[PDB]
C-alpha cells in the first residue's frame, strides 16, 4: 500500500491550508454571532413596536 504517500502529502506545506482553515472557522463564528444579534435585535423591534400601538 501507499498510505504513507497520501499522509506525507497532507503533512508537508500545511501552514497555508491550516491558516486558511483557521480564518474560515473564525468567519463562521463571527457569522454566527452576527446572526444571533440580528435575532435578538429583531425581537426588540417587535417588542418595542408592540408597546407603541397601545
Amino acid at each position: 500500500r501507499n498510505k504513507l504517500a497520501a499522509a506525507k502529502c497532507r503533512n508537508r506545506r500545511r501552514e497555508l491550508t491550516d491558516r486558511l482553515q483557521a480564518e474560515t472557522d473564525q468567519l463562521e463564528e463571527e457569522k454566527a454571532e452576527l446572526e444571533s444579534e440580528i435575532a435578538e435585535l429583531q425581537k426588540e423591534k417587535e417588542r418595542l413596536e408592540f408597546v407603541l400601538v397601545a
Binding site: 501507499n2 504517500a5 497520501a6 502529502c9 506545506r13 497555508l16 491550508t17 486558511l20 482553515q21 480564518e23 474560515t24 468567519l27 463562521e28 463571527e30 457569522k31 452576527l34 446572526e35 444579534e37 440580528i38 435585535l41 429583531q42 426588540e44 423591534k45 418595542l48 413596536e49 408597546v51 407603541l52
Partner: protein
C-alpha cells in the same frame, strides 16, 4: 520512480483545488459578514430610535 512523479502532481493539484475552495469560501463569508454587520448596525439604530420614542411619551 515515475509512480512518485504522477503521485506528487496528483497531490499538488489536490491542494490547489482545496485552496481555491477555501479562498472562495473566505471571500464569500466576508461579504456575508459585511452585509450582516451592516444589517446589525441598522437594527441597533432602529431599536434606539424606537426606545427614544417610548421614553418621550411617559
Amino acid at each position: 520512480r515515475l509512480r512518485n512523479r504522477i503521485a506528487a502532481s496528483k497531490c499538488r493539484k489536490r491542494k490547489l483545488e482545496r485552496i481555491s475552495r477555501l479562498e472562495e469560501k473566505v471571500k464569500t463569508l466576508k461579504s456575508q459578514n459585511t452585509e450582516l454587520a451592516s444589517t446589525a448596525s441598522l437594527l441597533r439604530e432602529q431599536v434606539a430610535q424606537l426606545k427614544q420614542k417610548v421614553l418621550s411619551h411617559v
